[PDB]
Design a protein around this motif. Structure first.
Motif, PDB file in Angstrom:
ATOM      1  N   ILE A   7       0.898  -1.170   0.000  1.00  0.00           N
ATOM      2  CA  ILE A   7       0.000   0.000   0.000  1.00  0.00           C
ATOM      3  C   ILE A   7       0.919   1.197   0.000  1.00  0.00           C
ATOM      4  O   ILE A   7       1.804   1.251   0.862  1.00  0.00           O
ATOM      5  N   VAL A   8       0.800   2.105  -0.984  1.00  0.00           N
ATOM      6  CA  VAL A   8       1.568   3.326  -1.151  1.00  0.00           C
ATOM      7  C   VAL A   8       0.646   4.534  -1.308  1.00  0.00           C
ATOM      8  O   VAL A   8      -0.516   4.350  -1.639  1.00  0.00           O
ATOM      9  N   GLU A  30      -6.719   9.215   4.821  1.00  0.00           N
ATOM     10  CA  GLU A  30      -5.809   8.320   4.085  1.00  0.00           C
ATOM     11  C   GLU A  30      -5.299   7.378   5.187  1.00  0.00           C
ATOM     12  O   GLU A  30      -5.318   6.138   5.160  1.00  0.00           O
ATOM     13  N   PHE A  31      -4.859   8.071   6.231  1.00  0.00           N
ATOM     14  CA  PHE A  31      -4.280   7.474   7.445  1.00  0.00           C
ATOM     15  C   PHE A  31      -5.368   6.617   8.107  1.00  0.00           C
ATOM     16  O   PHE A  31      -4.916   5.683   8.786  1.00  0.00           O
ATOM     17  N   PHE A  34      -5.359   3.671   5.393  1.00  0.00           N
ATOM     18  CA  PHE A  34      -4.126   2.839   5.470  1.00  0.00           C
ATOM     19  C   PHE A  34      -4.355   1.822   6.612  1.00  0.00           C
ATOM     20  O   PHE A  34      -4.119   0.624   6.502  1.00  0.00           O
ATOM     21  N   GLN A  35      -4.835   2.374   7.708  1.00  0.00           N
ATOM     22  CA  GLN A  35      -5.158   1.732   8.977  1.00  0.00           C
ATOM     23  C   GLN A  35      -6.164   0.588   8.950  1.00  0.00           C
ATOM     24  O   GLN A  35      -5.995  -0.479   9.561  1.00  0.00           O
ATOM     25  N   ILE A  60       6.652   6.725  12.408  1.00  0.00           N
ATOM     26  CA  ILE A  60       5.338   6.628  13.025  1.00  0.00           C
ATOM     27  C   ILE A  60       5.628   7.347  14.376  1.00  0.00           C
ATOM     28  O   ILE A  60       6.625   7.001  15.035  1.00  0.00           O
ATOM     29  N   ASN A  64       2.251   5.720  18.465  1.00  0.00           N
ATOM     30  CA  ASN A  64       1.637   4.815  17.537  1.00  0.00           C
ATOM     31  C   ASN A  64       2.280   3.471  17.267  1.00  0.00           C
ATOM     32  O   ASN A  64       1.667   2.791  16.395  1.00  0.00           O
ATOM     33  N   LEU A  67       1.799  -0.744  15.447  1.00  0.00           N
ATOM     34  CA  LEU A  67       0.507  -0.416  14.835  1.00  0.00           C
ATOM     35  C   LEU A  67      -0.449  -1.497  15.344  1.00  0.00           C
ATOM     36  O   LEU A  67      -0.416  -2.642  14.879  1.00  0.00           O
ATOM     37  N   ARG A  70      -2.074  -5.730  14.308  1.00  0.00           N
ATOM     38  CA  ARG A  70      -1.264  -6.216  13.196  1.00  0.00           C
ATOM     39  C   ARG A  70       0.061  -6.594  13.850  1.00  0.00           C
ATOM     40  O   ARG A  70       0.383  -6.014  14.901  1.00  0.00           O
ATOM     41  N   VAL A 115       4.140  -2.275   3.702  1.00  0.00           N
ATOM     42  CA  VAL A 115       3.810  -0.851   3.946  1.00  0.00           C
ATOM     43  C   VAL A 115       4.985   0.086   3.692  1.00  0.00           C
ATOM     44  O   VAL A 115       4.893   1.283   4.074  1.00  0.00           O
ATOM     45  N   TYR A 121       9.560  -2.104  -1.523  1.00  0.00           N
ATOM     46  CA  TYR A 121       8.593  -2.052  -2.607  1.00  0.00           C
ATOM     47  C   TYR A 121       9.109  -2.769  -3.842  1.00  0.00           C
ATOM     48  O   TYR A 121       8.461  -3.670  -4.390  1.00  0.00           O
TER      49      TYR A 121
HETATM   50  N1  LIG Z   1      -1.563   4.772   1.859  1.00  0.00           N
HETATM   51  C1  LIG Z   1      -0.494   4.835   2.593  1.00  0.00           C
HETATM   52  N2  LIG Z   1       0.399   3.889   2.452  1.00  0.00           N
HETATM   53  C2  LIG Z   1       1.492   3.876   3.227  1.00  0.00           C
HETATM   54  N3  LIG Z   1       2.345   2.855   3.026  1.00  0.00           N
HETATM   55  C3  LIG Z   1       1.741   4.880   4.177  1.00  0.00           C
HETATM   56  N4  LIG Z   1       2.852   4.918   4.934  1.00  0.00           N
HETATM   57  C4  LIG Z   1       2.957   5.887   5.773  1.00  0.00           C
HETATM   58  C5  LIG Z   1       4.182   5.910   6.647  1.00  0.00           C
HETATM   59  N5  LIG Z   1       4.071   6.843   7.767  1.00  0.00           N
HETATM   60  C6  LIG Z   1       3.074   6.556   8.692  1.00  0.00           C
HETATM   61  C7  LIG Z   1       2.789   7.479   9.697  1.00  0.00           C
HETATM   62  C8  LIG Z   1       1.803   7.221  10.654  1.00  0.00           C
HETATM   63  C9  LIG Z   1       1.091   6.005  10.588  1.00  0.00           C
HETATM   64  C10 LIG Z   1       0.017   5.759  11.572  1.00  0.00           C
HETATM   65  O1  LIG Z   1      -0.022   6.607  12.451  1.00  0.00           O
HETATM   66  N6  LIG Z   1      -0.842   4.765  11.492  1.00  0.00           N
HETATM   67  C11 LIG Z   1      -1.792   4.223  12.436  1.00  0.00           C
HETATM   68  C12 LIG Z   1      -3.026   5.084  12.323  1.00  0.00           C
HETATM   69  C13 LIG Z   1      -2.825   6.501  11.998  1.00  0.00           C
HETATM   70  C14 LIG Z   1      -4.196   6.998  11.960  1.00  0.00           C
HETATM   71  N7  LIG Z   1      -4.635   8.419  12.264  1.00  0.00           N
HETATM   72  C15 LIG Z   1      -4.703   9.785  12.568  1.00  0.00           C
HETATM   73  O2  LIG Z   1      -4.256  10.681  11.842  1.00  0.00           O
HETATM   74  C16 LIG Z   1      -5.418  10.285  13.812  1.00  0.00           C
HETATM   75  C17 LIG Z   1      -6.495   9.546  14.305  1.00  0.00           C
HETATM   76  C18 LIG Z   1      -7.184   9.993  15.445  1.00  0.00           C
HETATM   77  C19 LIG Z   1      -6.813  11.138  16.074  1.00  0.00           C
HETATM   78  C20 LIG Z   1      -5.729  11.904  15.602  1.00  0.00           C
HETATM   79  C21 LIG Z   1      -5.029  11.479  14.460  1.00  0.00           C
HETATM   80  C22 LIG Z   1      -3.867  12.326  13.994  1.00  0.00           C
HETATM   81  O3  LIG Z   1      -2.907  11.760  13.243  1.00  0.00           O
HETATM   82  O4  LIG Z   1      -3.739  13.510  14.268  1.00  0.00           O
HETATM   83  C23 LIG Z   1      -2.475   2.862  12.238  1.00  0.00           C
HETATM   84  O5  LIG Z   1      -3.027   2.437  13.293  1.00  0.00           O
HETATM   85  O6  LIG Z   1      -2.379   2.502  11.082  1.00  0.00           O
HETATM   86  C24 LIG Z   1       1.389   5.088   9.590  1.00  0.00           C
HETATM   87  C25 LIG Z   1       2.383   5.334   8.666  1.00  0.00           C
HETATM   88  C26 LIG Z   1       2.007   6.896   5.909  1.00  0.00           C
HETATM   89  N8  LIG Z   1       0.910   6.882   5.131  1.00  0.00           N
HETATM   90  C27 LIG Z   1       0.771   5.910   4.274  1.00  0.00           C
HETATM   91  N9  LIG Z   1      -0.327   5.863   3.458  1.00  0.00           N
END
Ligand SMILES: Nc1nc(N)c2nc(CNc3ccc(C(=O)N[C@@H](CCCNC(=O)c4ccccc4C(=O)O)C(=O)O)cc3)cnc2n1
Ligand SMILES: NC(=O)C1=CN([C@@H]2O[C@H](COP(=O)(O)OP(=O)(O)OC[C@H]3O[C@@H](n4cnc5c(N)ncnc54)[C@H](OP(=O)(O)O)[C@@H]3O)[C@@H](O)[C@H]2O)C=CC1
Length: 186
Positions: A7-8, A30-31, A34-35, A60, A64, A67, A70, A115, A121
């Protein structure tokens, strides 16, 4: 074993990172996507195994990790003891996969998600068989220094309307972007 997905989230210009960071302002949905994708297991009881490079892991918010819901697996050539919070630390990608063959991880893992980063990748993409790609396309250009390997549209079949993936255009703070899913099965 099971299923292998990547997933990108990429800028119009194929950029994925900048400064040990994301090139665009944070997009929560998105986040939250992704989650959800990484977490959602087919069969009840099984968990998803996510594999990332080292730099990706420390990006991260300390907050966090791992994750939740997982299995957190981290690749490094260099570290000797898994990072604080990681569950597995492997030396090569291929070992990470070899890990999931193990009858002790055979029953507890569903889907594997690559991820990131940038080299996982690329060798994850050269790996035979079936592989699905979950590409978020930010419909803008960002200033990046680590980029996603080009999709080989004649190797990769972009799937029109897949289950649980909102096929339309999104906007968070003036940035428009959509959820795509490419497949290959050779
Ligand atoms: N498509 C896609 N593909 C990827 N490969 C990818 N890689 C990254 C790499 N860097 C991160 C940074 C943070 C997280 C992370 O933190 N992940 C948590 C939930 C965050 C949710 N949420 C929030 O934003 C949030 C949710 C509730 C309250 C506050 C907040 C906030 O961030 O402010 C989880 O459990 O997966 C994951 C990767 C980022 N983006 C991506 N996008
Ligand atoms: N927008 C997005 O979707 C994504 C964005 N990003 C961003 O992009 C950057 C990530 O950068 P990237 O350079 O690609 O770094 P990675 O996080 O892939 O870190 C690479 C390090 O991890 C280890 N490693 C990586 N691949 C392997 C392997 N295949 N086998 C063994 N060890 C491996 C090595 O570790 P050591 O030297 O420790 O042995 C190497 O220095 C950051 O800015 C991050 O925020 C990252 C992923 C997705």
């Amino acid at each position: 074993v099971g299923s292998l997905n990547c997933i990108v989230a990429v800028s119009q210009n194929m950029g994925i990172g900048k400064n040990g960071d994301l090139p665009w302002p944070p997009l929560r949905n998105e986040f939250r996507y992704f989650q959800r994708m990484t977490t959602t297991s087919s069969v009840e009881g099984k968990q998803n195994l996510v594999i990332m490079g080292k730099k990706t892991w420390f990006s991260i918010p300390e907050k966090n990790r791992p994750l939740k819901g997982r299995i957190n697996l981290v690749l490094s050539r260099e570290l000797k003891e898994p990072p604080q919070g990681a569950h597995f630390l492997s030396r090569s990608l291929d070992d990470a996969l070899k890990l999931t063959e193990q009858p002790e991880l055979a029953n507890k893992v569903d889907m594997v998600w690559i991820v990131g980063g940038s080299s996982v990748y690329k060798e994850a993409m050269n790996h035979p068989g079936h592989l699905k790609l979950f590409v978020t396309r930010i419909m803008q250009d960002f200033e990046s220094d680590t980029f996603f390997p080009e999709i080989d549209l004649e190797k990769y079949k972009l799937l029109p309307e897949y289950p649980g993936v909102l096929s339309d255009v999104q906007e968070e703070k003036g940035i428009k972007y959509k959820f795509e899913v490419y497949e290959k099965n050779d």
